[model samples]
Target chain A: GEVPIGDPKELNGMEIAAVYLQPIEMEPRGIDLAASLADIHLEADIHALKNNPNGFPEGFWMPYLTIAYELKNTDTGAIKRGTLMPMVADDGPHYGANIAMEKDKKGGFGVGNYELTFYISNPEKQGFGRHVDEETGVGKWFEPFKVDYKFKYTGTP
Target chain B: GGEVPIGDPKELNGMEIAAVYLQPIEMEPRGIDLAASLADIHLEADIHALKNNPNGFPEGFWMPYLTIAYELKNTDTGAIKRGTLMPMVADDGPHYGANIAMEKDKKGGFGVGNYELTFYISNPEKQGFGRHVDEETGVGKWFEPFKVDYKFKYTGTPK
Candidate 1:
């Protein structure tokens, strides 16, 4: 089988996992936010579930995909995820995604699973610190949105 | 409005009628001639149907919206009209498009009208050809599963 290559030497080897939230296409009629809100440098923390203690003492870790979500709609050509993580490279039309990773501690290539969660913003753009008298954080006036999505995958096949 | 600043010379300046065909997403499900099929796809020539005289043409010169057609799949890109003209821009995806133009005798920027076009494709990967792997043409297979995407914009002061 042909091998799927990860990042090489100095090149950010981060492979893109296309995200697709079904029953939804590009930004629906009135929904204001899609993926761009995740751009502001939020905290990204990860921890291995501790099932295989002898394996990953390094414990999983990942930097925030970015501070903001940045998905773009194809029809309007407007940036979709205005300030958040980009939709998986090719799957820009779908929605909502968060990622984390665990590595091979011993080096020869091993397998593992990961638990992921994302503090996504509400679909309609709100409370993004826009009303705080233009000084504090105006985003306080909008609504709030957050959710957790979990999935597992094997590494080093 | 005050005199607008001169726009980019390279930027398209006028609105013109054009047509395009979206070749069905190629599955290449079973036995099929991929390249021959793509090459065999059909594109309908567009006809301009306007009631009044075109605003952009000069005496004896007229802008007949150029008959344009593009069918961008993954592998093949660009405008191949009457089998020759390849009007493609750089740093863009595999999309074929064109605006109508009358012969040089007609002095005008371009014609304007609603355009209708038909599209088709044969031997298919996802779009048609495949990614370019070696020096050949396409990689033969997809690096990953893919889909077809499109966009259309009309930016001009309506008459």
Candidate 2:
């Protein structure tokens, strides 16, 4: 899972790092619908990282991992997949975690070229498991991948 | 600004508590990792102020929109355990903007010993951060539901 197709870097080792936002809010007013970038926060950080897979912690933003996506629409070709949630902000920890894809009747995520794809599945398989407890074990989880991006879904201020 | 008098724990009126304590045992915010929490561990605090209108946007939560609840208290068996926390952002990002969760009716369930933790900031405009009185839309008002106490020492090994 180490980068090769459409390459955007780190496939098995991890890397998508960011895809910011803050547009729509609600969740007891706390906001957490896959990090609240949309569920249309195109109010906008243009969403879309990874580094830890073993014992974790070093820069670890990697949680129970599961962020799937696939947006295609170069010119009415159309197609938009979903799944992203493992968020964190304040500029401290991030690798990827956000959701939002629009453009069917005037709105965001509807401006130009598109071709983003990221599967990334591994936290043992989402729920996380590694520590053996022989005294405190840690190691294993890393072998699930897909990474690609060339998305030019423009405009933001 | 109106009548402040909370005085230093790290300061709070709008916000600023930079750090609290306890770490490790995060399986996607407690989804069950590190071998189901090996026996337990994880509690944090680190909140910053400022939130008049979308600044931390929705990054991970904590910017004037507050509702952080917690209370362990078992200094011997005075017996108590309240809960409500989790506005997290990782890699040490938004620690206790809100934290400590494990719901299903057990709420952050953890027990070991020497405890006495507290952090309540309930009623953030009822959690929606609202304000706009009537007359002339009085603008905003509502921020004063505080409590912050700490002194935990749990020995850990609970299953």
Candidate 3:
């Protein structure tokens, strides 16, 4: 006998429900381009939610997610790295960020091989808070979650 | 003969900027609404082509992340103020390329007088690629500063 797979939604506590990027064809199969200025549009969806069976507390407690990325040129070994906070605005639940890039006259993004990696995280080690909690005499803290992804693309002459 | 003086768009290497004027810039009484003037300042820009992207391909493109630097100087006295704005795009694409909301004066209103506003827009690669901020990336190109003039007529109760 085997234990049947449980409904993920039935699970509670703080966690990353899903992490995905649009244009699924971008996985192993990179995009093909003839021009240098053609854009490589990648939109990410990182769902960081809290299912506190204990219910919502009166004091203020919100979730936060950090998205960091690095683009590398395989042939030239050039790299560009940056970070951003994805879960901005008061919009409920679902939240993420976007990464859109195009060729510039600068030599960084010229004809070469490239690799992009995204790192998403929510760490209690480094937390953010709004208002104070009278009960615990401390602000409510967010549970941490971390995930990453790597994708590819090629440029032609 | 009376003629309404107007400002024209200026072009610099890799960028184009045009500043427009707006009137009836009002402020509400009480509290901090310093963010009011942001509506009065309007600007537009065009940064020709780029070579920075994931694939390293070159082409015309739109970047949602850009920091616009603004400075308003009192035409009469030697006084200056500064602010920053992040221009964004909607689902319809890059229709509203540039627009910014200037913060209200700490005095609750900028004194009535003519003001010369200078704006600066830099390349996207020069920024960290997120919500816009005023830090120089040091590796990208920046257009020359463009200037426009306007007046601040306070409609709120005078001090």
Candidate 4:
């Protein structure tokens, strides 16, 4: 996924969202290829996800999730440049594969700062698979972009 | 996951823990079924989908993307009870689901009070699936909950 849009304020204090990401990390024990397999299964309906009705809501995913990159002066510990992006969670027919940061939590991708953040509105409310809420209940009540995750810098100048 | 044995007013709001329910609706056709299925098949491992990540720290499924609920009442109408459940994107799960008022949007159950509604919260950051600090950027950010749906009671109070 790409980064979401935000200012220094929203990005700095308070938790605004519940972050989600691709299968960045995995351990199948023996399936060196499990990562590949998992990737295959990971491909599902973004729309289905957004509007599962029983799942997520529609037009919900667009402004809900976001991803971004940050550059910093390693020595000064100051933010240099950053790019916030809201990846398109299209339904897949055309743009199936994603064009996002390839590096995992390993961090380091060059430059003064190397950090990637993941934010989600509500982590507890996500009823993906086995979980079911057939009765009266609330949805999307979590903070969005209000929360985030940071990775270390690993890139070389 | 961490727990507070007991919630403190200073730390947490003094509000009594509230849990509102929602009504379920049939899966309506929106036109993105096939595409979604394909995408789900593609990036299935996306942690957002609840796909497990072993090597990744703080790994978890995307299921049960919990949210907070607020109760509201009409105030004017003898309607009894009314409120809206807001669902923000960037959440771990769906935006809106069943509204407990009508047995989940289906229409049946009923709440009381001249204007009474309860609000509940689900703390995941407390559960561990929230907040990731990037060493690169000092900015630790996340999206917050947006209003998903509204609940209003009016006309009749179930017999």
Per-model DockQ against the true two-chain complex: 0.01, 0.05, 0.04, 0.05
Give a tens-digit lDDT track for model 4, residues B1-159. 111111111112211222222212222222212222221111011113212222111122222233545444435443333333333322234333222232122232333323334434453332233222223211123234332222333322122
Report the C-alpha lDDT of model 4 over A1-157, residue by residue, as the tens digit.
Answer: 4232232222221223322233322111232122332221111112223234333443223222333323333444544222232211212110012112233223332333333333333233332221222322233333455222343422211
Query: Of the candidates shown, which would achieve the greatest lDDT relative to the real structure?
Result: 2
Off by over 4 Å in 1: A1-84, A93-110, A122-142, B1-159
Ranking of predictions according to DockQ? 4, 2, 3, 1
**Compared with the true structure, what per-residue lDDT tens digits does model 1 show for residues B1-159?**
211111111101122223342221121112221221223221222222223222212122111212232333221222222221121211111122222221111433212222212222111122221112222211222223222223322122221
True contacts recovered per prediction = 0.00, 0.03, 0.01, 0.03
TM-score of candidate 1 to 2 decimals: 0.19
Clashes in candidate 1: how many? Answer: 52
Residue B24, model 4: Cα distance from true site in angstroms: 6.1
Higher-ranked by DockQ: 1 or 2:
2
Candidate 3 lDDT over residue span B1-159, tens digit each: 111222554544433344443231222121222232344333333322243422211233332234566666666654586666333211111211222243344533345555566665654334332221112111222333344334443222221
The 10 consecutive residues of candidate 2 chain A with the worst lDDT sum are: A40-49
True contacts kept of 1: 0.00
Task: List candidate 2 segments past 4 Å from native.
Answer: A1-70, A74-116, A121-131, A134-144, A147-157, B1-159
Question: For candidate 1 chain B, which ten residues in a row score worst on lDDT?
Answer: B2-11
Q: Compose the digit string of candidate 3's lDDT tens values, residues A46-136.
A: 3224433222222112223455656666666777765533221111122332233435444565444566554555322222211121221
lDDT of 1: 0.22
Off by over 4 Å in 3: A1-157, B1-6, B21-64, B89-112, B129-159
Least lDDT summed over 10 consecutive residues: which range in candidate 2 chain B? B1-10
Question: What are the lDDT scores of the predictions, listed in order?
Answer: 0.22, 0.44, 0.34, 0.27
